[PDB]
Amino acid sequence: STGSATTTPIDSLDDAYITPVQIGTPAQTLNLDFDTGSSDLWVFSSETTASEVDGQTIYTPSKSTTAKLLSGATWSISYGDGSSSSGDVYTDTVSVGGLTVTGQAVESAKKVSSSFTEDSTIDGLLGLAFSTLNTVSPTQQKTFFDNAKASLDSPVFTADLGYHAPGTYNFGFIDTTAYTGSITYTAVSTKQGFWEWTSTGYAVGSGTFKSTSIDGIADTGTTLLYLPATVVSAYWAQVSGAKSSSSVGGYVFPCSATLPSFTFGVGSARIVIPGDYIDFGPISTGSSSCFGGIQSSAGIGINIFGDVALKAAFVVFNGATTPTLGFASK
Numbered sequence: 001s002t003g004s005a006t007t008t009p010i011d012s013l014d015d016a017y018i019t020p021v022q023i024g025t026p027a028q029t030l031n032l033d034f035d036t037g038s039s040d041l042w043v044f045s046s047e048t049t050a051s052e053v054d055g056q057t058i059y060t061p062s063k064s065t066t067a068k069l070l071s072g073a074t075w076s077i078s079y080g081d082g083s084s085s086s087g088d089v090y091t092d093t094v095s096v097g098g099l100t101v102t103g104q105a106v107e108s109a110k111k112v113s114s115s116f117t118e119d120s121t122i123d124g125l126l127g128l129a130f131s132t133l134n135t136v137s138p139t140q141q142k143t144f145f146d147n148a149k150a151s152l153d154s155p156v157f158t159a160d161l162g163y164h165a166p167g168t169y170n171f172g173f174i175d176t177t178a179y180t181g182s183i184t185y186t187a188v189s190t191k192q193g194f195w196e197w198t199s200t201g202y203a204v205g206s207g208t209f210k211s212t213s214i215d216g217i218a219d220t221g222t223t224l225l226y227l228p229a230t231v232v233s234a235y236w237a238q239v240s241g242a243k244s245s246s247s248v249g250g251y252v253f254p255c256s257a258t259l260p261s262f263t264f265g266v267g268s269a270r271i272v273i274p275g276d277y278i279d280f281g282p283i284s285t286g287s288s289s290c291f292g293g294i295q296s297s298a299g300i301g302i303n304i305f306g307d308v309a310l311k312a313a314f315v316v317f318n319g320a321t322t323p324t325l326g327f328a329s330k
Helices: 144-151 229-236
Strands: 003-009 017-023 028-035 041-043 068-078 084-096 099-112 124-127 156-160 167-171 184-187 196-204 210-218 225-227 243-245 250-254 262-266 269-273 279-282 289-292 294-296 303-305 314-318 324-328
Touching: 003 084, 028 041, 041 084, 068 099, 099 144, 184 196, 196 229, 210 225, 229 250, 229 294, 250 294
Parallel strands: 028 124, 041 099, 210 303, 225 294
Antiparallel strands: 003 017, 003 167, 017 028, 017 084, 041 124, 068 084, 084 099, 156 167, 156 314, 184 324, 196 210, 196 262, 225 303, 243 250, 250 289, 262 269, 279 289, 314 324
16 A cells, blocks of 8 residues: 655744644544654544644544544653643544554544644644654554554655645655655664664855764654754854854844755765755744754754755655665755
């Protein structure tokens, strides 16, 4: 089997992407944030504290003939950005882009933090990291990909995120029309439960490439590119007037700037992030200070190749017995 679904930016900045997902019978379609940095499929639901729901579409398990309470199971997650959610668990039929999994754990939120409530466009998350990170207790549950894998034509999914435009998540096949050149594959460590890999270096603008190993995670659920302070300083030093602002929470730059590109290495290959991808716009409405899309990972504890990096590439998440990651230009 295969599946193919369009993923759409939630706003003009590509702060996140939503993908429609069919849950239950008859189908209830919710728009979920596909997140290769976590491993829970959770939704706003009829059980979510009413004051914490503000415009989201909810899953109502009582209206699904295939929903079953997973008795005794609870979940609770906290994300890198400080947001969180928790609740109980149903199993139900879940389909993405024509690919159907029966008996998928659908984690129903009883509580969500303010960041979730305040974003009316995201109805939940669909985790695509390794199932070892799944938070369901006392019986850990499998991700949608893990459940689908054996049925897929090939044990892979791909992320093709757009810059200020829709893109695609495919399951079970590689669309050879969706990228240019060849795909370069690189080793993955699953030791921390992430799609963790090592970039071979970077360049800033038309500058020379610096060969240096940068361990990090391919994370579709993180907006920005978080790299070591040395790398980030080298980038922003090429933008007149750019500075790190403790009050704003990272590097800002004059909105009048033209940003240089940023290149990262994948083996001997190179992925170029155009400068425009690094512009996250005014820090507040009307401001002439703009927020940067490359930020320091210092004090996160891990480097994160988030959407800013991934949307410059066609990315293969290869879930074969020994997983790997592939990157192509597009």
